Amino acid sequence: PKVSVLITVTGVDQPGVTATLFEVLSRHGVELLNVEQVVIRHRLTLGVLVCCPADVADGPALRHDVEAAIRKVGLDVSIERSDDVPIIREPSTHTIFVLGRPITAAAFGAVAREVAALGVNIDLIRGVSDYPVIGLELRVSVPPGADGALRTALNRVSSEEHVDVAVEDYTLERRAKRLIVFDVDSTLVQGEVIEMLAAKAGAEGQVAAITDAAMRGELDFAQSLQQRVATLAGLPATVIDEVAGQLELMPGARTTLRTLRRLGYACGVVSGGFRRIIEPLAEELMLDYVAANELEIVDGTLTGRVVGPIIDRAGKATALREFAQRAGVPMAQTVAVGGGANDIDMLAAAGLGIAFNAKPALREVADASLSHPYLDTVLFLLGVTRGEIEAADAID
Amino acid sequence: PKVSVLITVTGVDQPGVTATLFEVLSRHGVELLNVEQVVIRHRLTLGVLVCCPADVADGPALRHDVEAAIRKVGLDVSIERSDDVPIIREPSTHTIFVLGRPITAAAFGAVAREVAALGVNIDLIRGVSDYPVIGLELRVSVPPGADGALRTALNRVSSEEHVDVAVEDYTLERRAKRLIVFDVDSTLVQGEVIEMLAAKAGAEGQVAAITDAAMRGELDFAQSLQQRVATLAGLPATVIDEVAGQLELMPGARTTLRTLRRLGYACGVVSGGFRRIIEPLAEELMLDYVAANELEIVDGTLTGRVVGPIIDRAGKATALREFAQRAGVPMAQTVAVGGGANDIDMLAAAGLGIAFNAKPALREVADASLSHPYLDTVLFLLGVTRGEIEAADAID
Ligand SMILES: [Mg+2]
Ligand SMILES: [Mg+2]
Structure with missing residues (x-):
């Protein structure tokens, strides 16, 4: 022929x-x-x-x-x-996720209009989910040197139209993500453990205020940690198991972890919280790596200090790097998920850094942001559809 | 609304x-x-x-x-x-690959007709490659309990129409393949090392005949190995480096391995050949695992025997299992690629077993068969497109 x-x-x-x-x-x-x-x-x-x-x-x-x-x-x-x-x-050079509840026509219109303005051609659109939120994917072809301008334009659209918009590299390599780390508090777990410990001392007031102050980036994490843990000085160490037994997983967390195991991810947590609370939990969730801080105890009583070294903002990045080296995963194939300014260095070190219901200081530097209270929307950002999750789970 | x-x-x-x-x-x-x-x-x-x-x-x-x-x-x-x-x-429940050079209309027609006869709905068709061969993918939805009948029908079509046809599970889990093993001879490497060693003894005749006899499954692998290695009795061990330096990779091998590294695969070789030839090569290819047989040497001279234990047909499966346990990869997420009846137990143990330019005894039990002399067609069976390979390689 x-x-x-x-x-x-x-x-x-x-x-x-x-x-x-x-x-x-x-x-x-x-x-x-x-x-x-x-x-x-x-x-x-x-x-x-x-x-x-x-x-x-x-x-x-x-x-x-x-x-x-x-x-x-x-x-x-x-x-x-x-x-x-x-x-x-x-x-396609990139892919774009649009998550909303709802996704108005105006929102998607605004996305499609920003895409067009920057010479970006749309190759495919499909739905990736109908619950817990509406999720749409656009595989796009971006002119070289325009994707900075694109993420920027689409972030403006995201804030104005009340949808999550994430732009990601769709290259073979950069999209074989193999390792993920979660922050624990207000990410994998509901609420702030340190506030739950503080309530036992009748200090949730003081500590909640400082925690919000620290997670918004207005405070040095270490001094903020020292001021918060000090309020616990004199509590019996038995208070650690009590709070550990009061922890509720974030909605979608089990689904998120289970699906990540199916995909053969290495899964870890990197926290500034406390190892005696997190290790017991990380074992339950069958995680591969833990790093946390450690409460000082004397005669079965908390002293109000932590036992150095402190995992600070920089420490979190260092722990991700450590985890990744051990697992044999290049930084570009790593994922980090956090909600506080505590996590800024970690997210920027990771291949893909995802801000989950996050403070402004983190959303501003995160590759991608999620505004809905379902941790499994993380899975949509990793190229998984709701249908595929549901199918795999029904095979049990 | x-x-x-x-x-x-x-x-x-x-x-x-x-x-x-x-x-x-x-x-x-x-x-x-x-x-x-x-x-x-x-x-x-x-x-x-x-x-x-x-x-x-x-x-x-x-x-x-x-x-x-x-x-x-x-x-x-x-x-x-x-x-x-x-x-x-x-x-989609499954995906189907059609590789040919050429793919006639009649061939694809025959595929699409077998698909229809078994109540199988076609959800998507796309091209996955234009070189080295033409490659087409059909994501299909198979009625439950019909995919045995499908692979069977499509194998008949494959033989009759001269195209490769592979049916694979398209589930989330089963398609996060993380580990691959190659046989070396006539798979990763061109030709038979044992015949190259035999030519040094003026015995390529005897040994080529027995090797074809063994790879077609007509002979016990161990007795066949013993009869073949015996022809080398008395060659200086220097002959090992000579042959090692004469080995040509299979066309597409470097591309195959490089792309598999991008995807973060664990890569290994499982051979019945000889470690002094294969280890030197596996180091060069930056592989994660080697298992081979071992030539007996006395005073720098080959004795004509191997030093037990012999890697036999069963040994190959055992080595895959060993490799997979160490890497932390479930058998369903493992891939094995071979060309001889030597490899039958290995392919059947693996999640996906691929016969590459293989003897009848292997094609008959392999999940999937390839008939073209390009090892990178393996990549198409793992959900990779030629475009994606070329793009990633151009980023260097
Ligand atoms: Mg947090
Ligand atoms: Mg072979």
Whole structure:
């Protein structure tokens, strides 16, 4: 076959069309170069790019066989020479996630308009979830040196339209994510353990105020840790198990971890909280790595200090790096999820840094932000669909 | 928004259509439930499923705004109530690869016809490669308990039509493949080392005959190994480096391994050949695991025996299992690639067992078979496209 021909079938989806078309093409000298077919909402698009004998292409017979077969059953078909035509479309450079509850038309309109303004072509759109939130994906092709401007434009859109918008590299390498770390407090676990410990001392007031002050980045994490843990001076150490037994996982956490195990992720937690609370939990969740701070105890009583070294903002990044080196995972294939300014160095070190219901100081430097109280929306950012989760879980 | 509406735009692709449609929908009470959009060969299909106020849906205005905006620029659009309509399509159960050089229309026709006969619905078709061979993928939905019958039907088609046809589970878990092992001889490396050693003894004749006899499964691997290595009795051990330096990688091998590293695979070789030849090579290829047999040497001279234990057909499976346990990878997420009856137990132990230019005894039990002399066609079976390889390699 020395000449190329493109055949394009469109119309209301009926069964047997695919087989019929290729059964027809076999009565001509036809060899396949590319086939693309989808049905969206009962609309068939079937594009077939072939090579065929020069004398077959230059003859009405091939045309008449195809047009007869396809038009008969009710669909449309076009046939034309190619030769210059690209055989197989190029990969998308990036992918974009839009999560909302709801996603207004105006919101998605604003996204699609920012995309267009920056010469960014949309290659594919699909739904990735219908619960817990609506999730849409756009695989896009970004002009080189425009993706900074894109994330920026789309962040403005995200704030103004009340949806999450994440732009991610869609390269083979950068999208084989293999390792994830969570912060514990207000990320993997509901609320602040240190405030739960403080309530036992009748100090939740003092400590909640300082914690919000520290997670918004207004305070040095270490001095803030020292001032907060000091309020616990004199509590019996038995208070650690009490609080540990009062911890509720973030909605979607179990689903998030279970799905990450299916995908063969290394899973870890990096916290500024307390090891006696977190290790007992990390064992339960079957995690691969823990790093936390440690409460000082004397005669079964908390002294109000921690036992150095303190895991600070920098320490969190150092622990991610440590975890990644041990697991044999390059930094670009690592994921970090946090909610506080505590986590800023960690997120920026990771391949993908995800801010989860986060303070402004973190959202501003995070690769991606989530504003809904479901930790499994993290999974959508990692290329997983709700359907795929539900399917896999039903196999038990 | 209490009532659902489906909007479906089709026609010749023009820019700005996407943004335009959502800018129009925002003047109505529209919230998005699902968006699906693709362009194939300049055919736009844009399907939008929304919820909107009951009084907006029951009014001509929404219809007239949408129909006006879309028809004006040259495309078609339909609008209709939904309510019963599925929000987001279910995942495909399986995926099917068709590799050929060429892929005739008749071949693909035969595939699509077998698929249809077994109640199997086609969800998507796309090209995955234009070199070294033509590669097509069909994501399909298989009725439960029909995929045995499918692989069987498609194997008949594969033999008759001269294309490779592979059916694979498309579940989240089973498709997060994390570990691969290659056989060395006539798989990762061109030809048979043992025959190259034998040629040094003027025995390539005897040994080639026995090797073909063993790889076709007509011989016990161990007795065949003993008879073949015995022909080397008396060669200087220097002959090992000579042959090691004469080895050519299989076409596509470097590409295959490099791409597998990008994806973060654990990579290993499991051979019945000789460690002094393979270890030197596995170090060069930066592999994670080696298991081979070992030549006996006395005073710098080969004795013609191997030093037990012999890696036999069962040993290969045992080594895969060993490798997988160490790497922390479940058997279902493991891949094995071989060409001889030597490899039968290994392939069946692996999640996905790939026969590469293989003897009949292996093709008959392999999950998937490849008939073309390019080892990187393995990558297509692992969900990678040629475009994605080329893109990633150009980033260097
Ligand atoms: Mg936190
Ligand atoms: Mg072999």
